[PDB]
Amino acid sequence: YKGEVLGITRFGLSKMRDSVLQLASFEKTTDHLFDAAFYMKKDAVEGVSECIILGQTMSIGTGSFKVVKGTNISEKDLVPKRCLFESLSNEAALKAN
């Protein structure tokens, strides 16, 4: 899908990805980190092999959606209560000044 027939070997899997943790910890961990640090790649951690390291929920399996609770607001806690001094700001706060 990247255009040519890539392999699953250490040179093929070095392509096709951006997550330098799983690019490193496959077959050669010697200078994949050094190759990432010299060219200063800003890798956004999102997958699974780089989320088992930092310890966060991955986006595959169960963690494909963040569960949420409904807050059953019946459109009553949306209207505020005006204080009894705010019509005076239209009455006598712009009177010739």
Binding site: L84, E91, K95, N97
Partner: protein
């Protein structure tokens, strides 16, 4: 905890005094031991409400502070009918806003607080309004 607006609305007396009174209505008006010495009173209105960390300080340390600040040399109530006309009747002439904030907050006795609040009283503005716009003080 980020802040969106700084002065959305500035408040004043009695309406907010009744707001603090309605928040004081979570327990009683004054009774503290009559509800603690009897059997339940709906289990003490559902087992001793939210006062526990520091909440008894707030609104109780300011309901005394807003009530008695008359500042009279000697040796205390507001109502609906006394503020509903105070909002409208004093809106007469070209007058500022914090002037009326301190008028609604502090009641001038005869002339002292009225001289203190109104800056440039004799330099910017003329006479007789110190005298005519003061006799609404009898509305308590």
């Amino acid at each position: 905890m980020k802040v969106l607006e700084e002065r959305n609305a500035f408040l004043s007396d009695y309406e907010v005094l009744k707001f603090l009174t309605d928040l004081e209505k979570k327990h009683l008006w004054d009774q503290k031991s009559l509800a603690a010495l009897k059997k339940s009173r709906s289990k003490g209105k559902q087992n001793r409400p939210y006062n526990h960390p520091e909440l008894q300080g707030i609104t109780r340390n300011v309901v005394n502070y807003l009530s008695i600040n008359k500042n009279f040399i000697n040796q205390s109530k507001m109502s609906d009918e006394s503020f509903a006309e105070l909002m409208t009747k004093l809106n007469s002439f070209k007058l500022f806003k914090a002037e009326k904030l301190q008028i609604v907050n502090q009641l001038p006795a005869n002339m002292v607080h009225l001289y203190s609040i109104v800056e440039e009283c004799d330099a910017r503005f003329d006479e007789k309004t110190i005298e005519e716009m003061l006799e609404i003080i009898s509305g308590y």
